[PDB]
Amino acid sequence: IPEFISKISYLSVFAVATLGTYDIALDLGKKVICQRDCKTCNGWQALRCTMCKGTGSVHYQIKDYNLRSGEKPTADCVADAIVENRAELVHLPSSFNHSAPLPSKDCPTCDGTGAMSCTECKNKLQVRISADDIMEPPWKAYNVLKKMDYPYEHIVHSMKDPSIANFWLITLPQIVGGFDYDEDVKKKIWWQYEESMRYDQLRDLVAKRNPGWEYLQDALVSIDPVRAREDPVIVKNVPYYKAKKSLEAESQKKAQKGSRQRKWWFF
């Protein structure tokens, strides 16, 4: 009994010793192992889930319904089919904006987080061997800053002026570079600029609420689809806005009635 305790303690101290040596043995390899770099997710193993844009509250819709012979397409029958999954439940992005706001629930492709992990990266090759992580390189910083875009929106919106466009487009390159443009170059710049200004001219004209503005609204939705899909000036449902405008006019009429007969009782 005493010899066994002495032996097991004298073996335990040396077991502690060899385990401790193995700790440093793994530790030396621990700072020369790095995460394998990809080109989709840059090794971060996550990109913004584009099918929900990162918001996550995607709209849902019933596409087809296998109705029983003898029923009417009501709403409760559709719900009962949803209980037994006899209707085609489909996911619509919140990027598509609809006239009727559909139920916005969590996106199954990202489980509500808003990102997809890089499935191209595989578990067998998730680690690298390079000691690049210790010496902070110029190329990683330049790459992580190459996806920052230097967002130019602060000049593109301010650019819509003939004198200011003249300055920015022509005068600044001619002064800084010390060169002079050919007339073909200047005229092509001016033509492409005037061609680009069509959408903002039409947006300004449709913003007047002048009579017959739905025709210019359809012109806006015809000239460029993607931008017109997000412009807040364009209304999805025209009778909606028109009758709400008439209702607001009669509402301020009755508001005037209230605010004018409220002053005839204290006298």
């Binding site: 913004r48 997809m116 210790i134």
Partner: protein, 77 residues
Amino acid sequence: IVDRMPIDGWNDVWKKLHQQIVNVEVFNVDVVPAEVYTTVATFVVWSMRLALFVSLYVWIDSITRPIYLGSLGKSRA
């Protein structure tokens, strides 16, 4: 702490951040003093564990163990 901010929302995220924020805090901790800390620290900590175990072992042992051409001169005498 936010989890796995994926790749490319930041230029949109900083679109709102920069308008709400009043003061950002940026930490500067390099890698090499951290790694020097790892190696020296695991050395000293594991030697501390070894010292505690060997002291306990030696004390408990010093307490418990005392309780336990070849026929010439052989032919004429």
